[PDB]
């Protein structure tokens with residue numbers, strides 16, 4: 517079982533992966549997010565957020581509306597399965613989630629909810645294997 521992934525969000529508005537695999541034997545799964553570069557949170561903060569494919573657009577839209585001081589996430593958003601905080605350069609965060617929260621046949625997406633980042637393709641698939 518490989519139950520973790522290290523991901524980077526950079527000063528150029530990209531993640532260094534667009535596909536995460538979760539071994540289904542993993543009871544829990546960990547995402548270790550870091551931010552190469554030197555842009556601070558208020559300019560190019562990133563987070564890592566997991567939802568169903570169908571819920572992504574909404575989480576993103578509501579997140580942008582919620583604003584930077586709420587880490588670009590609507591408080592108590594039930595569409596959000598797991599998430600890191602918003603981080604700037606030299607910062608890091610991790611999130612660990614229950615792998616049983618991922619159901620068969622469902623499509624999952626990860627993304628950064630910061631204003632316009634996901635549109636710029638800071639997103640990818642998350643898949644149970």
Ligand SMILES: [Cu+]
Pocket residue numbers: 525560561562563628629630633638
């Ligand atoms: Cu971002």
